[PDB]
Amino acid sequence: QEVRLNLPEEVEDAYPLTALQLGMIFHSEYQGNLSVYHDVFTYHIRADFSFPALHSAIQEIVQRHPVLRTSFALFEYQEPLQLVHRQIDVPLGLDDLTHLSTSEQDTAIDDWIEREKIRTFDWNIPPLFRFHLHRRSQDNFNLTFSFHHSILDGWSVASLLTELLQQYLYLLDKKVLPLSPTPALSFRDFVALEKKTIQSPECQNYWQEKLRDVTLTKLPQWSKSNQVNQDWDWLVPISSQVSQGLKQLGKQVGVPLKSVLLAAHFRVLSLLNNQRDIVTGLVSNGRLEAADGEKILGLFLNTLPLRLELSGGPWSDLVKQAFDVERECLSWRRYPLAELQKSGQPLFDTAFNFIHFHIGVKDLEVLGGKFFNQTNFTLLANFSLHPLSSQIELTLKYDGNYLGEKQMELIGGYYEKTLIAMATEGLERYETCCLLSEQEQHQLLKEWNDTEVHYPDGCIHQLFEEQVKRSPDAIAIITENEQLTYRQLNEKANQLGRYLARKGVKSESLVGICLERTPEMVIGLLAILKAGGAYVPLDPAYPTERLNVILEDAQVSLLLTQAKLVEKLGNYPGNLVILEAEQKNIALESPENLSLPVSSSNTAYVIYTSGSTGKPKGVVIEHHSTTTLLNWSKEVFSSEELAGVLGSTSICFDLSVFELFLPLAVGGKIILAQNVLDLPSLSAAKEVTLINTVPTAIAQLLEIEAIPETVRTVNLAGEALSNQLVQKLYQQENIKNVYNLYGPSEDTTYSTFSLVPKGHHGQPSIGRPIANTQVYILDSFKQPVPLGTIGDLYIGGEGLARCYLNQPELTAEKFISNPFSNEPNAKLYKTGDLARYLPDGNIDFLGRGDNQVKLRGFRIELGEIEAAVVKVWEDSYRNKRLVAYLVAENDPINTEDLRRFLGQKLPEYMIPALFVSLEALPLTPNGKIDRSRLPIPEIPSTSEQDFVPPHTQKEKILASIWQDILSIKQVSRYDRFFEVGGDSIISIQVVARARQAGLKITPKQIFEYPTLAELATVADYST
């Protein structure tokens, strides 16, 4: 070996770094913040000092342990490797501050630590630590130890300080306690043992099987620590009683106490993620199994991805399966984390750690307990057993860039209440126990569902009849070829309703309707309602089968049709009321209002939808649910907005219930059209003050400048609403309100509403519930999810349907008992949609639960156009990546700028790798979109096989460096770092070999400018 013997005489030993050591420097120097894995421990001490014996005692310890004389040589050699220097002098800093009061003394000490912790170490120059003294009285003094975590774990520090203080007193004649020689020790024996382990096929295949089809999870983020600096420690109270009960539980189950505390961690993660399949890092203390193999100092840690599914059960079952998953991976535990995953595919967001441990002249620390230390984990649960009380306690160490105090306050409560339940009610089902704070329960369940409003009872047509009395000569409908006054419309609805009544239609009688969109259509609706029946909507502009499958399901009493559509019908064996055939017999009927004793609980209509697989399902909507919607709409929309409401939606769909009956309830008029795309070619387009449609259709009308300047409100509902679009609509200055509304057919037409602000930033929400409607975000066990967590959207209140027609079993499945109401009838409708709450109570709609897709990093959903459409193009790999479909407006967009812009705003696993610059996106009419008809892209390479543009704007030195460390021939200037096989651990030796080459770069600059092109510019010289 010409390296063993080509070492400085300074160095006596040399051996490579572990993947963790390189992982730690990677995190320490990821940016210039430089606070992670630089630990600073201080100690306030009543004693008699010995600044010479204290110093010499350090010299005894540093020569005692090679890791305490270790330098780092990163780039210069083949692999980064640790250089063990033969001996080093190490000073002890001193400050005298007796002249200051005790309160002033800690201000100046914390000031010293705050300065020291970001004061980086020079790896190549030993030692990787510093000591320091602050003098207060001749007996009060602070001793501070500042070190880098790549050299020492918390265990190493513990026994490092121990050997110290019994060689400090050794040189003091207080008690002579001789120190024993070092054992068969080597941090290399571990470094050598960890190398053997990376190439062992039994470790690789084991974790390959254990992690096969995991569901990775990121914690929810809706806050940051922009207030607290480095008090990123959250203290979770644990009382004496609860510590004892936690110990009792581990005895009863028969596992070590650590497995009880680990099960609490798993409980809160499942709660926070609404995920039963949970992965979290277990901090393992990989010491050499020989005796006196835990007295050697160094870094012996590996963090393993423990996987576990929370099916449910008593707490004791969760404990036992936390024990089962720990021994399961006991022997295979030294396989390093970096070899498990890849850079940018972190296996877990969080981690668990448990710290077991255990006179008057000096010895005792008076205020010696301040430990500053940070990891790279967003949430580390730092359990320990206090050495003197033997009581359990917990500190949540969190990443303020990812979790704020408004969030950590709730996380800490979840941990506190989880440990309460385990210690006191440790025999309940853990998946039903309420871990949410009393404050959070009230806000999620009460305050954000406080929508009760007392409206007049009654029916849909009663709202119309009353408006006829109040303005009988006002216009009710304007079609292309006629109008009708409120009296004129009413009198015909009475006449048709009487003819139907004397044909034999009464309460709960279903009469369908297949009519071309003319005023007889609305007359048909109103006459059916005025008699006391309920209409089943049919639209002649739809294929004949769709009509048949509904009539089949509904089995209607009789059908109102025109002579021109009976033909379209498959000879419905029931009674027909071919309208024009016997208009003569209509006209004999009275014009007076039928005043039948209709109940608001009678069915008003049966709206037919399709399930996920495509079966018919008729939604039975009562009058009171519709009147509640209309009465609420009276409050929200003005008379000037309701002056002319466009009737564009097919009555087969529930948005027609809003467009038709609402203007008739207030005095406005239906501006009737065949669809929203006929609006520009319509006579009364000038009269339209409100349109009620779907985002794509209003985009259609926007390109061609087809929105009448008299339109003052736009109601949007039915697909994803881009804030880019509401901002165009508001730019037409007459448009005064733009609403995003949500609601399944099972909850009448609308369930939630949001008056999307002008200039509003970010995703538009679907808002919060309308009058007499309640919303809940639950898990599979119908438990409310924490604020910000994704869950199933449930809806209750006055808008819920009776049932699915002729399908009572599906009705029970979808309309479940309401756990949050005492009322007898109280149901909740399972929407099948996912959602979460924004902090202000607004609801963030996340789509149906079925098509929410998957990938490593974190398996969740797409719908992230907020940055266009995203797709999943399954290729014959069955190994996949995210695809974009962009358009833009004028000049091209730097597609990479569109990724780094999202790098600091959106998570990396969600950020796609493939872009497509398009123009024409698919749509087969104005509603049905075709995801499967999106252009399958081509791999950017080929055509340019050995595509190698020369590299002349100082890529020169950068390309050199990539080439030497990555073993590839030469690089192209537009190549990406991670695609040519670079990772986090390699990013360091890229920064380092760029250092002596005259360039300063950060690992953060590598991960946001991974191309050799944009990385070369942000590179610096610094004279």
Ligand SMILES: Nc1ncnc2c1ncn2[C@@H]1O[C@H](COP(=O)(O)OP(=O)(O)OP(=O)(O)O)[C@@H](O)[C@H]1O
């Ligand atoms: N990505 C999104 N961002 C904001 N709002 C959305 C999004 N997707 C749907 N919505 C809202 O949901 C309401 C109606 O549900 P919608 O049919 O749009 O759900 P979807 O996600 O588009 O469809 P699916 O439920 O089939 O995934 C509309 O008000 C619409 O604004």
Ligand SMILES: *P(=O)(O)OCC(C)(C)[C@@H](O)C(=O)NCCC(=O)NCCS
């Ligand atoms: P890159 O994306 O490959 O980065 C890898 C890593 C640095 C995140 C990882 O390999 C790593 O080293 N994690 C550190 C494990 C740890 O924190 N151990 C001690 C916890 S106190």
